[PDB]
């Protein structure tokens, strides 16, 4: 059997996160607006797509290991990470073992989550690997 042909939103698999308004974050753990994205599992048997576990891997924020780091440097935002959620509002912590759900479209949500007391503005890009582990 073939594995699933994985496609995202656009062909570049880039999720547009918008812009950071630093003065909107007031407490550690506060989340910005939801950014939905979908990952499609195409051209594979339901025998296969029903039996795949998924995980997000990346460099974690230095204060919150469950969310993605936006990096460091001049003009880079501080004290926020990129948090990932399933379509039921549950956090999907990064760098965890493959996880299963119970369809060939996985709907996720990305948000900026405050990881420190005083958030500062700037560019807030993140990178992740979406891994599918086949049974």
């Amino acid at each position: 059997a073939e594995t699933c042909r994985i496609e995202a939103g656009d062909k570049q698999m880039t999720v547009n996160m918008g812009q950071i308004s630093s003065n909107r974050f007031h407490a550690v753990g506060e989340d910005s607006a939801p950014v939905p994205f979908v990952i499609h599992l195409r051209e594979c048997s339901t025998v296969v797509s029903e039996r795949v576990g998924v995980a997000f891997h990346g460099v974690a924020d230095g204060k919150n290991p469950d969310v993605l780091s936006v990096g460091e440097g001049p003009g880079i935002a501080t004290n926020i990470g990129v948090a990932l959620f399933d379509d039921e509002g549950n956090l999907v912590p990064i760098n965890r073992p493959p996880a299963n759900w119970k369809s060939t479209s996985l709907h996720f949500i990305a948000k900026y989550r405050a990881t420190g007391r005083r958030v500062t503005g700037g560019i807030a890009n993140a990178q992740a690997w979406f891994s599918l582990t086949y049974q």
């Binding site: 994985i6 812009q19 025998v47 599918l132």
Partner: protein, 206 residues
């Protein structure tokens, strides 16, 4: 988008290499393809070499990954050993930088790589029926007396579906039994070709 030609690789001991197809079906997409093998714990493991380890797929095409045995014959000869084949597809198309912040994704497909000794006596297509079961009040243990990993799925106790289980060769795996689990066990497996095997009735140990 990128797919692999199989959902597992059976590596026959003694072969210099094993092939795995990788395809892109989209004329308007280009990917970098990066491949490597991990051990059962997910740690990159040099005992298998993948060539080419990194290459470009521009548009619609099929390519062949070659997995090379570099174990120096050190793996067990009486049972399969479990590795993970990893194929990363990096979208490599000329995008344009926006004012927008972005979350950039890449995809990794991970499939089992079973190193299979030569000259095993029991045929692979007779392994699934050898599974046995041991039952307590709150748990069910699966017993695999064969040299092959068994990927057990659609495991039912009465009407209650249980967790899937990977049962190691000459080993055991345990799953939880909910309160309403019935006494009639049935199961299937995923075979060498990624297919579901026939529904079988679970036989209790001894």
């Amino acid at each position: 988008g990128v797919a692999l030609g199989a959902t597992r690789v059976i590596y026959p001991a003694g072969q210099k290499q094993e092939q795995l197809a990788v395809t892109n079906n989209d004329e308007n997409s280009t990917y970098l393809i990066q491949s490597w093998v991990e051990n059962a714990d997910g740690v990159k493991d040099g005992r298998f070499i993948v060539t080419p380890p990194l290459f470009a797929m521009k548009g619609k095409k099929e390519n062949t990954l070659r997995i090379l045995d570099a174990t120096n014959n050190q793996l067990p000869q009486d049972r399969e050993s479990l590795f993970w084949m990893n194929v990363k597809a990096i979208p490599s198309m000329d995008k344009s930088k926006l004012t927008e912040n972005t979350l950039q994704l890449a995809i990794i497909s991970r499939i089992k790589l079973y190193y299979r000794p030569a000259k095993l006596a029991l045929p692979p297509d007779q392994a699934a029926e050898k599974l046995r079961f041991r039952r307590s009040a709150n748990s069910l243990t699966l017993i695999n007396p064969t040299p092959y990993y068994l990927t057990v799925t659609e495991l039912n106790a009465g009407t209650r579906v249980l967790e899937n289980a990977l049962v190691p060769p000459m080993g055991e795996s345990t799953v939880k039994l909910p309160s309403d689990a019935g006494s009639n066990i049935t199961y299937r497996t995923i075979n060498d070709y990624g297919a579901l095997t026939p529904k079988m009735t679970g036989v209790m140990e001894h």
